[PDB]
Amino acid sequence: YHLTTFLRHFLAHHPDGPHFGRNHIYQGTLELPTPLIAAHQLYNYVADHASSYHMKPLRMEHNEYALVSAWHSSDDFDVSLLVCHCRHVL
């Protein structure tokens, strides 16, 4: 399941945030300048070495891959992060 589309739908339909839910969400985009290495090639290499980067290469008949991370933090919270890459810039 393309969870990126799920979260896009969710934030499109509730782009405000109710005033009672203790949870929070945030979306942003990063354009990494990658002239030395191709953006697709660099993304694929990082995905192949996600464990080295502590990410996780989950799938999504093409199966797109997203790098995810999670960790507890502090008021206690559970913090997570998922990244999907969407000619020398990533």
Swiss-Prot record:
Q: Where in the cell is it found?
A: Lysosome membrane; Peroxisome
Tell me which domain of life the UniProt entry assigns to the organism this sequence originates from.
Eukaryota
Kindly state the tissue distribution recorded for this protein.
Expressed in the brain, predominantly in the parietal and frontal cortex, as well as in dorsal root ganglia. Expressed in peripheral white blood cells.
Q: What does this protein do?
A: As part of the KICSTOR complex functions in the amino acid-sensing branch of the TORC1 signaling pathway. Recruits, in an amino acid-independent manner, the GATOR1 complex to the lysosomal membranes and allows its interaction with GATOR2 and the RAG GTPases. Functions upstream of the RAG GTPases and is required to negatively regulate mTORC1 signaling in absence of amino acids. In absence of the KICSTOR complex mTORC1 is constitutively localized to the lysosome and activated. The KICSTOR complex is also probably involved in the regulation of mTORC1 by glucose.
Q: Which disease is it linked to?
A: Developmental and epileptic encephalopathy 18: A severe autosomal recessive neurologic disorder characterized by lack of psychomotor development apparent from birth, dysmorphic facial features, early onset of refractory seizures, and thick corpus callosum and persistent cavum septum pellucidum on brain imaging.
Q: How does it assemble?
A: Part of the KICSTOR complex composed of KPTN, ITFG2, KICS2 and SZT2. SZT2 probably serves as a link between the other three proteins in the KICSTOR complex and mediates the direct interaction with the GATOR1 complex.
Q: What is the official name of this protein in its record? A: KICSTOR complex protein SZT2
> Which stretch of the intact protein is present?
3069 to 3187 of 3432
